[model samples]
Target: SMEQVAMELRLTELTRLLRSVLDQLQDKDPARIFAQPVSLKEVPDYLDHIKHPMDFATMRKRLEAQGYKNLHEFEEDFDLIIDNCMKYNARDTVFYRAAVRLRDQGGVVLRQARREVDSIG
Candidate 1:
């Protein structure tokens, strides 16, 4: 059975890269709206639409836990963070607009990371 064993150097790269990604997402949103979990009280019927709610704070903690493998693993969770915004908030809303920009910007960052980590590949 595969208990677990992965690339230590790659883990270090992913940890640092994800932290950088989180930092960029936070700073990119000057209002810092997505910094934490979306408040159910603040957002009416949040759970009604978004089944898998995600946030930077939760991602940060998981990264801190070193609970990650490849860069693509974190990428999926990151994408959910963006996907939820587009899903829950309307297009005319600021949240949706930011989500669009962030999805694009975050893509740029992810590409940068892919190349960066590819050095270890």
Candidate 2:
């Protein structure tokens, strides 16, 4: 219990960062595209262009698994989540427009991660 407290505090920092991003997505995606996994039956050709889909549901599953130890590693999933939509959806589409805004969210998170990583060293 004693040694683990330190470890818990360490992990809690990064994991909470993961959860914070996830929490924001829960309410933010009105299009519902980013909230859940892509539907192959509904989307039909979704996987044809977007491989390794990332969504809020999977991100939570990933965070629950305690997936990564560093801040940027967690940020990478967010990048994929945004990048997948950018690639699959047209620039003029609602999905792409939403992804564009979320990209800004990612950059601010990058600010948090930058401070986190800088403090790491």
Candidate 3:
């Protein structure tokens, strides 16, 4: 699973990067102070639009209505949708753990949503 792999890889990468950043911080390096990734401001925007908790049925229906036939594709779209929102909003702290958790849960929900939707009708 990409999520699983990504989680592991992200953790490892974050740990390494964080340690490196810290070393630089301790050394009082003037060339570089920190490393950053995409913004997380858009998470609020995404959640704002969501209003309520995510619903597989409703989400699937809306996605289908939009001509999204493949459930897998839909899941990817959802991830990107949420990611883009987070990027826009840009969280204050670099919550690496939180990021992994969000992606992991999103993938799981996407799979479950597909199953629930497909089982109906």
Query: How would you encode candidate 1's per-residue C-alpha lDDT over 1-121 as one tens digit per residue?
Result: 2333446656776788778877876676777767789988888788889898888888899999878777788888888988999987799999999888888777777788888768756
Q: Write the per-residue lDDT of candidate 2 for residues 1-121, one digit (tens) a residue.
A: 9899988777877787668766765555666768888888898988889878888888888787777777677778888889999999899998899998888765765676568656863
Off by over 4 Å in 3: 1-65, 81-95
Q: Candidate 3, residues 3-115: lDDT per residue as tens digits?
A: 98866654454334333322332233122211232223734444544433332333434443443434455455445534543443447544433444555554554455546
List RMSD in Å for every model shown.
2.9, 2.7, 17.5
User: What is the alpha-carbon lDDT of model 2 when measured against the actual structure?
Assistant: 0.77
Best by TM-score: 1
What TM-score, over all chains together, does every model reach? 0.84, 0.79, 0.31
Q: Which stretches of candidate 2 lie over 4 Å from their true place?
A: 1-9, 25-31
Better of 1 and 2 by lDDT: 1
Q: Candidate 2: RMSD over Cα atoms?
A: 2.7
- The lDDT leader among the candidates is 1
lDDT of the structure predicted as candidate 1: 0.81
Error of 3 at 15 (Å): 40
Ranking by lDDT: 1, 2, 3
